[PDB]
Every structure is written in structure tokens, then in C-alpha cells.
């Protein structure tokens, strides 16, 4: 369980993300695909993209980045009370997309790395720790739902 102080560190860096969610989403997805190429293969929509330049130029990829970060943002704003938000996400990612917990760990790493690079003013050691804790809680609860839904993850 995160403290209120920890949630505020999470929300204060997220306030900067929301200055330009599209730009942040591009950076995170590109980092994910570059650092772990196998994750791109899960996207039948995007696996044709060969280079970072093509990824950067993809309006469709930008749109999805916005969708992902807005969904995550809505979860973080619930400060742990995210049961309703997590249900449809868990089901689609378990049953349709088939996304292992390992891959959710990869995107968490991508999120942390981008926030660290972009936002040293609001992503110092305490803030990064709080964001890690929040993303760990996300993955923990998703993993629990995965098993309920009949997916190993």
C-alpha cells in the first residue's frame, strides 16, 4: 500500500506528462520497442514499423500512446482504488492481446526511463521509488486478475 505522500510524488510527475501526453507516449513506446524488440511482435497493428524514424512518423502509434498513458493516468489518479479500471484491461490483455507480466515489467521500465530523462525536476530518487511502487502495485493486481481469468501471464 502506497502512502499519500508517495501518491503525490506519482501525481506530481504525471502532471508534467500531461503537458504533452502524445510526446511522452511516443518516447515510451519507442523505448519499449527498442529495448525489447519482442514486445513489438504483440502489435499486429505496429509490427511493420522497421525503424525509430518510422515509429516517430506514425500518427497511429502516437494515438495509441495517448490511449495507453491516459488509461494508466486514470488508474494512478485512483490511488490504489482501481478495481473498475483494471477489470477490462486485465481481460483484454490476458485473453485478446496475450501480454505476459514480463512485458508489463518492460513497459514499466520504459516509463521510468523516459520520466527520469525528461523530468529530473520531479523524478528524483524519492519520486522514482514512488512511481516504481505504483507500477509494481499495478502489475501485482493485474497478475492476480490474470490468474482469475485463467491466464498464466
Asked whether position 89 contacts ligand XE by CB under 6 A, the answer is: yes
Using the minimum distance from each CB to ligand XE, give the nearer residue, 14 or 65: 65
Percentage helix, strand, coil for the chain under 3-state DSSP, each rounded to 5: 75, 0, 25
Binding residues for O2 are 64
Q: Position of cell 493486481?
A: 141
Within 7-46, the residues that bind ligand XE by CB under 6 A are 25, 28-29
CB of 87 to ligand XE, least distance (A): 11
Within 93-132, the residues that bind ligand HEM by CB under 6 A are 93, 97, 99, 103-104, 107
Rg (CA), the chain: 15
Task: Put residue 79 in one of left, alpha, beta given phi > 0 → left and psi -120 to 50 → alpha.
Answer: left
CA–CA–CA angle 107, 111, 116 (5° rounding): 145
Concatenating the DSSP letter of every residue in 96-134 gives IS---HHHHHHHHHHHHHHHHHH-TTT-SHHHHHHHHHH
Considering only 7, 65, 118, 131, the residue that binds ligand XE (CB under 6 A) is 65
Asked whether position 89 contacts ligand HEM by CB under 6 A, the answer is: yes
Q: Which residues bind ligand HEM (CB under 6 A)?
A: 39, 42-43, 45, 67-68, 71-72, 89, 92-93, 97, 99, 103-104, 107
Q: Which residues bind ligand XE (CB under 6 A)?
A: 25, 28-29, 65, 68-69, 75-76, 82, 89, 93, 104, 107-108, 134-135, 137-139, 142
Amino acid at each position: 500500500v502506497l502512502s499519500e505522500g508517495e501518491w503525490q510524488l506519482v501525481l506530481h510527475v504525471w502532471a508534467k506528462v500531461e503537458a504533452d501526453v502524445a510526446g511522452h507516449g511516443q518516447d515510451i513506446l519507442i523505448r519499449l520497442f527498442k529495448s525489447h524488440p519482442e514486445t513489438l511482435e504483440k502489435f499486429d497493428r505496429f509490427k511493420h514499423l522497421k525503424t525509430e524514424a518510422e515509429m516517430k512518423a506514425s500518427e497511429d502509434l502516437k494515438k495509441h500512446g495517448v490511449t495507453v498513458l491516459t488509461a494508466l493516468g486514470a488508474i494512478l489518479k485512483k490511488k490504489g482504488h482501481h478495481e473498475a479500471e483494471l477489470k477490462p484491461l486485465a481481460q483484454s490483455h490476458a485473453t485478446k492481446h496475450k501480454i505476459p507480466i514480463k512485458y508489463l515489467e518492460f513497459i514499466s521500465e520504459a516509463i521510468i526511463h523516459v520520466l527520469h530523462s525528461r523530468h529530473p525536476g520531479d523524478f528524483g530518487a524519492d519520486a522514482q521509488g514512488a512511481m516504481n511502487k505504483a507500477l509494481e502495485l499495478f502489475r501485482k493486481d493485474i497478475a492476480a486478475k490474470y490468474k482469475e481469468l485463467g491466464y498464466q501471464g
